[PDB]
Design a protein around this ligand. Structure first.
Ligand SMILES: COC(=O)c1ccc([C@@](C/C=C/c2ccccc2)(Cc2ccc(C(F)(F)P(=O)(O)O)cc2)n2nnc3ccccc32)cc1
Ligand SMILES: [Cl-]
Length: 285
């Protein structure tokens, strides 16, 4: 029985009544709030891209660093969906070493980037194979191994080396290049293809640390990506796909980092991509 017909019928109802803005505002104003005391310390001012975008103390990633353990990065743990993500801001010129430090320490194998370096964000990875990067502060080396450019995203293989131990790891970089700030992806299809590619790569697997997802602030596009991924896992893990309340899921995620999903349009897009994504996986796969 087409249960997807019932939930696409009410998506059409929200579209027809023009109710996306009200629904999104109702989410914003129900969102939880927690202290961000460490983000707001004097010494950490230059470690934050944006004045108001801060990680909650309870969910922030700690660098393994005695001097200063702070990075603007939050751990999103989705218990029922059985998925963890790290959401972070676009690295600053002074935080690139901290970023790769975080990647190493958290044993992530995948980085998901949803913004562009020039739209901001530092060039935190090598653009050229023959020109490696050394992060002197954190004692790490990064080399671009491969780069596969498509029209709406780019997939890169990176080698991250700990210069202290000399161990190296392969890091997969999934860069969605056509998603404007406060905007939407080019299409549901392009979004879903990008997401399925991340999934198939093994980067989201519990064998590894959490995937690192970032945009510029690490809240709007980052929140949209993770919401869509989480809701798809829930629609598959559950007996009833229509039981998945995207509002309830977003609020849950927002317990771990503020401001996730930044526009009513991004919310609507997340619903659309989840409905389309669930048709695909729960239909002929
Ligand atoms: C022309 O507009 C801007 O230059 C601009 C700059 C910063 C911002 C955000 C606006 C602050 C939003 C916010 C902060 C705390 C909780 C919830 C929302 C930061 C922000 C930038 C981009 C995004 C995004 F959605 F494009 P992402 O996809 O990269 O995450 C989000 C946020 N911000 N953070 N502190 C601020 C202080 C004064 C004014 C704006 C401030 C918004 C617009
Ligand atoms: Cl918000």
């Amino acid at each position: 029985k087409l249960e997807f017909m019932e939930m696409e019928k009410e998506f059409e109802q929200i579209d027809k009544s023009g109710s996306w803005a009200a629904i999104y505002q109702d989410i914003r104003h129900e969102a939880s709030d927690f202290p961000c005391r460490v983000a707001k310390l004097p010494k950490n001012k230059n470690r934050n891209r944006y004045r108001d975008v801060s990680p909650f103390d309870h969910s922030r990633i700690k660098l393994h660093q005695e001097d200063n353990d702070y990075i603007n990065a939050s751990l999103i743990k989705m218990e029922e969906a059985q998925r963890s993500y790290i959401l972070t801001q676009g690295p600053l010129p002074n935080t690139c070493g901290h970023f790769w430090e975080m990647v190493w320490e958290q044993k992530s194998r995948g980085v998901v980037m949803l913004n562009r370096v020039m739209e901001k964000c530092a060039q935190y990875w090598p653009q050229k194979e023959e020109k490696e990067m050394i992060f002197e502060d954190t004692n790490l080396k990064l080399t671009l191994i491969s780069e596969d450019i498509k029209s709406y995203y780019t997939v890169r293989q990176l080698e991250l080396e700990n210069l202290t131990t000399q161990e190296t790891r392969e890091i997969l970089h999934f860069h969605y290049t056509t998603w404007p700030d406060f905007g939407v992806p080019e299409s549901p299809a392009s979004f879903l293809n990008f997401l399925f590619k991340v999934r198939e790569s093994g980067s989201l697997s519990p064998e590894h640390g959490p995937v690192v997802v970032h945009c510029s602030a690490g809240i709007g596009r980052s929140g949209t990506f993770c919401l869509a991924d989480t809701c798809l896992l829930l629609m598959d893990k559950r007996k009833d796909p229509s039981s998945v309340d995207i509002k309830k899921v977003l609020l849950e995620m927002r317990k771990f980092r503020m401001g996730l999903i930044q526009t009513a349009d991004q919310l609507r897009f997340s619903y659309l991509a989840v409905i389309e994504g669930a048709k695909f996986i729960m239909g002929d796969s």
